[PDB]
Write a protein that binds this DNA or RNA. Structure first.
Lengths: 182, 126, 136, 75, 79, 53
RNA sequence: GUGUAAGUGCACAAGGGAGCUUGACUGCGAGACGGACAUGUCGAGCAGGGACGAAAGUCGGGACUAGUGAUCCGGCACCUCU
RNA sequence: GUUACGGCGGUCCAUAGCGGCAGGGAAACGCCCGGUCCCAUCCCGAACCCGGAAGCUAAGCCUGCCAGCGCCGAUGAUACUACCCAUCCGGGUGGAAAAGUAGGACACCGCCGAACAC
């Protein structure tokens, strides 16, 4: 007994508009976002093993779920990197929590970037999966932006059952990502 | 001229099931006095067999499709329970008391486990 | 000079001199070829001498292919040493050459000069050989 | 989701402090990260969060040398 | 002025020991081997060193089961 | 081999009310020595030993 | 990739990961390999008493082969032997 | 018995695979709706698990088509070889490859269950 904003919108308008654009036979062919992905590469694992915990705490406060700590399966010593050194955190988002996260991101933070002209239409890949990146976490009001001791940027990537970049960009437009309309 | 990209989870789930079922099958055996109790599940209904892997033959059978088993009202679990009853009766008619239990590539618990536990209760030795 | 840049095993048995060719019994890339008849080990220096013999007999333009490469070493061991006490070090590199096999292929227009050149390169080698046209 | 608890999850009302085009919806943002004023926008009552800036208050795609001047300025 | 080579390792007597057709008792050793060059089939068991042995008497049949050479044992006919 | 203070060190594993020393060779740069352990003694049954050197 | 050299094998995984955990047990052992001799190698199956598992069943160290030294003479604990 | 059905298996396991084309959804195989209850994520009801049948055969799957990517594959000859003859060379009786070729092949078989029927 509840509905998020973007999901109600998705089931109302966007499916209709893509149908009226691309004319699929079955509606099962309709594109739909599955999951959302978050990652943070600490990179100074061999110099600060504590920024890892810092990033864990930030993403906790940001996404409302305890992250995963991705280990280094290979040992490349030109970076000090050794088998099992924690280099980064990672979180998966699916469902109502995902739609809420996109609502927050599109409505609070991305309208808080400094001189946001536009996210490119060219972060796609093969079929329409949008892989962008943030330099700082100085933007989410979710975050306690008084306590941060360093910039700890991140990298986001958005995956969809779309089959090509045209359908991907069209769907993400209907959903309200500020592309550079070109 | 629309065209897809790759694997659907139906294919994934199917071939993973076959993968782990024919993993498990290494240890399970078949014989006409100790046959294998295979189970084959779907979301809606369920099927089971007693198998002799010496000849790849079959001695009993049951499923939740038969109207006499649909005459249950209760949960999926209760359908499964009555199925275990029927297969106990049929197996012990055709002349099998002891068997093994192949979970067929599925996890134990829920409908599978309630079936098997009903059968253990109603006489089969496993 | 012809040598490989590296071999895995730098001390090998002596190649065999038994049997006829399986490949290289057919001129490939030129017009006028050389074909062996005997069994022999042909080294680096011989082939250098021969290609120079050919290039100093055509002297301008016309191409020369060498379908052989010395990829099998042999081991001399230092002088006046009693037998035993190991296996000597590689010093020169041979290619085995079974009868029927083709060594050289020329591409120069006139058969006169070409046949003569190949003959001058035959007289720089240990084997009886003959000259080939690509035809049947 | 699972024990080994995550942050807490409660609704939120993001009150548009730009032009009054507010938002309100379920979230994982709560005791964790919420503001006072439990204002019911709906049949129930749940926390509120002043929204210093947003979309309809952030000019962007979704929101809104010269010689002819030199000798305009230089007369 | 030394040959630093010269070592070697004594044998282990590996290979097949009861070929096709023969009569074998129980617990008898068909093959000694390092890896599972030959795998077990029916009425055959594996060891620690990937040796094989018989679990039931009978006679041999080196057949394949999905691309892998197996070893089996079949019932002798009782006299 | 010898009796040097090797990394793989120590021995003796004695039993409570069970006098059947079971032996094992283990390291000693790790911490522990007051938990785990089990085995079958004489006249008795599956019960708990110490690593007592 | 497999702890460590190489080979034979491993995707049906013996590779990677998580939960319990001590069978890295006791008393034996049919029949066999290899075999100068002493050494050496596997071993189904039985019994007590256990682990894991829902059960079937597997567990008498490590994916296998190397990682150590006969006999004599002494040393420590236990024995209802003298 | 039978159809474009499902499931368990087998072949000394690609003659069975990959890719392209068309085509099917009665009961079933499915995908899908949602996390109330068992149960679960090294975070995520994504997976496993649970409760149902709004929707679609788009995909999985099954059916036919394409010998194209791969595979299979002879006869005869040759290489090699056992034995014998033979003063070097070479040869005779028997055995017989690899490659290549002709070709084959878009698998075959068994059991139970359904649906269908006398």
């Amino acid at each position: 007994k509840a509905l998020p904003r973007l999901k109600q919108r998705y089931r109302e308008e966007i499916r209709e508009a893509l149908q009226q654009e691309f004319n699929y036979a079955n509606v099962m062919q309709i594109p739909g976002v599955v999951k959302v992905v978050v990652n943070m590469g600490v990179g100074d694992a061999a110099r600060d093993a504590k920024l890892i915990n810092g990033a864990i705490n930030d993403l906790a406060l940001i996404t409302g779920q305890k992250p995963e700590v991705r280990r280094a399966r290979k040992s490349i010593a030109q970076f000090k990197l050794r088998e099992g050194m924690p280099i980064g955190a990672r979180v998966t988002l699916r469902g109502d929590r995902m739609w809420e996260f996109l609502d927050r991101l599109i409505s609070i933070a991305l309208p808080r970037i400094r001189d946001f002209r536009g996210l490119s239409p060219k972060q796609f890949d093969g079929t329409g999966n949008y892989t962008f990146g943030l330099n700082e976490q100085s933007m989410f009001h979710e975050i306690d932006v008084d306590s941060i001791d360093r910039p700890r940027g991140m990298d986001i990537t958005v995956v969809t059952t779309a089959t090509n970049d045209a359908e991907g960009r069209a769907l993400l437009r209907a959903l309200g990502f500020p592309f550079k309309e070109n | 001229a629309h065209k897809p990209v790759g694997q659907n989870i139906s294919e994934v789930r199917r071939n993973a099931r076959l993968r782990r079922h024919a993993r498990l099958r290494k240890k399970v055996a078949g014989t006409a006095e100790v046959p294998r109790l295979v189970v084959n599940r779907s979301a809606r209904h369920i099927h089971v067999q007693l198998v002799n892997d010496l000849n790849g033959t079959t001695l009993a059978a049951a499923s939740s499709i038969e109207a006499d088993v649909r005459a249950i009202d209760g949960d999926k679990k209760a359908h499964s329970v009555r199925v275990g009853q029927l297969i106990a009766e049929r197996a012990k008619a055709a002349g099998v008391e002891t068997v093994v239990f192949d979970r067929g590539g599925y996890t134990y618990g829920g409908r599978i486990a309630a079936l098997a536990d009903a059968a253990r209760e109603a006489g089969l030795k496993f | 000079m012809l040598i490989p840049r590296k071999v895995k095993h730098r001390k090998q048995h002596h190649p065999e001199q038994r049997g006829i060719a399986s490949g290289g019994t057919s001129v490939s890339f030129g017009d006028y070829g050389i074909q062996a008849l005997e069994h022999a080990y042909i080294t680096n220096r011989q082939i250098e001498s021969a290609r120079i013999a050919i290039n100093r007999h055509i002297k301008r333009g016309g191409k020369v292919w060498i379908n052989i490469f010395p990829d099998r070493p042999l081991t001399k061991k230092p002088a006046e040493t009693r037998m035993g006490s190991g296996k000597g070090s590689p010093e020169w590199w041979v290619a085995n050459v079974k009868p029927g096999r083709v060594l050289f292929e020329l591409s120069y227009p006139d058969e006169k000069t070409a046949r003569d050149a190949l003959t001058r390169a035959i007289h720089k080698l240990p084997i009886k050989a003959r000259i080939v046209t690509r035809e049947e | 989701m699972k024990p080994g608890i995550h942050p807490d999850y409660h609704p939120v009302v993001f009150q548009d402090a730009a032009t009054g085009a507010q938002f309100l919806t379920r979230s994982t943002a709560t005791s964790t990260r919420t503001i006072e004023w439990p204002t019911p926008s709906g049949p129930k009552t749940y926390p509120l969060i002043v929204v210093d800036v947003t979309s309809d208050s952030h000019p962007f795609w979704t929101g809104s040398g010269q010689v002819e001047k030199f000798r305009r300025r230089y007369g | 002025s030394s040959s630093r080579n010269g070592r070697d390792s004594a044998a282990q007597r590996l290979g097949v020991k009861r070929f096709g057709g023969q009569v074998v008792k129980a617990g008898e050793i068909l093959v000694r081997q390092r890896g599972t060059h030959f795998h077990p089939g029916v009425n055959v068991g594996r060891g620690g060193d990937d040796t094989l042995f018989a679990l039931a008497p009978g006679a041999v049949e080196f057949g394949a089961k999905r691309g892998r050479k197996t070893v089996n044992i079949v019932p002798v006919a009782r006299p | 081999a010898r009796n040097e203070i090797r990394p793989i060190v120590k021995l003796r594993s004695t039993a409570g009310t069970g006098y059947t020393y079971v032996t094992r060779k283990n390291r000693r740069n790790d911490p522990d020595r007051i938990v785990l352990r089990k085995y079958d003694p004489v006249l008795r049954r599956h019960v708990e030993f110490r690593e007592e050197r």
